[PDB]
């Protein structure tokens, strides 16, 4: 992913927010 003008924790909540629970 790309976190440009963001952090990590937040960034993930946009790109790594692929939960199928």
- Residue bearing tokens 């790309």: 2
- Residue bearing tokens 């909540």: 13
Token pair for 19:
């939960």
Three-state SS letters, 4-15: CCCCCHHHHHHH
d(CA 13, CA 7): 10
d(CA 21, CA 3): 25
What is the DSSP secondary structure assignment for residue 1, as one 8-state letter?
A: -
d(CA 6, CA 19): 21
Token pair for 15:
């790109």
Sequence-distant (≥ 6) Cβ neighbours of residue 3 within 8 angstroms? 10, 11
d(CA 21, CA 14): 17
d(CA 1, CA 9): 12
The CA distances from residue 11 to 20, 21, in Å, are 18, 20
């Amino acid at each position: 992913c790309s976190c440009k003008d963001m952090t990590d924790k937040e960034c993930l909540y946009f790109c790594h927010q692929d939960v199928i629970w």
